[PDB]
């Protein structure tokens, strides 16, 4: 829905959110190429509670496996990390103090 240079950065913001399911699928011994691809197919249909099932070794329901994460954990992980990376591209000059 955006245009200009803003549309190329939200896609870079959205592609960086797929790293944590790629991290969870790679550490579980699953194939991370087909796991994150299947996760985008389940959430496009309407499955908002779909994720990586480390017990079955695939994609299943999360609330059936009783995996509950608080909202303040995930909101502050997105708010503090975005505020940090908004400063590193602004703070860039190496000055070695004597």
């Amino acid at each position: 829905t955006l245009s200009g240079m803003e549309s190329y950065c939200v896609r870079a913001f959205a592609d960086a959110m797929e790293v944590i399911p790629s991290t969870l699928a790679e550490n579980a011994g699953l194939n991370p190429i087909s796991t994150v691809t299947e996760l985008r197919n389940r959430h496009a249909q309407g499955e908002k509670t779909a994720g990586i099932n480390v017990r079955k070794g695939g994609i299943s329901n999360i609330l059936e496996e009783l995996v509950v994460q608080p909202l303040l954990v995930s909101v502050s992980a997105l708010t503090l990390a975005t505020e940090t990376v908004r400063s590193i591209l602004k703070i860039d000059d190496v000055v070695n103090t004597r």
Binding site: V19, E26, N31, P32, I33
Partner: protein, 77 residues
Amino acid sequence: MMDVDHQIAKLMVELSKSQDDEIGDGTTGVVVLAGALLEEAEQLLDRGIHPIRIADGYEQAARVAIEHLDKISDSVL
């Protein structure tokens, strides 16, 4: 004319020499292209894709680039 003692970057020196020995015009562009194929393979490496599976995917992709480049070609010398 560099003093690069790095065995991966030494292969980029022999790549520019091999373009000079065969054709001799695109010695600069063959290093930027080889660095571009390896830069795009860095993000694919973090997704768990096998490096030979990327190399097998580049051969099926470069085969399309050879056949498509032979569409419009004519000279009357």
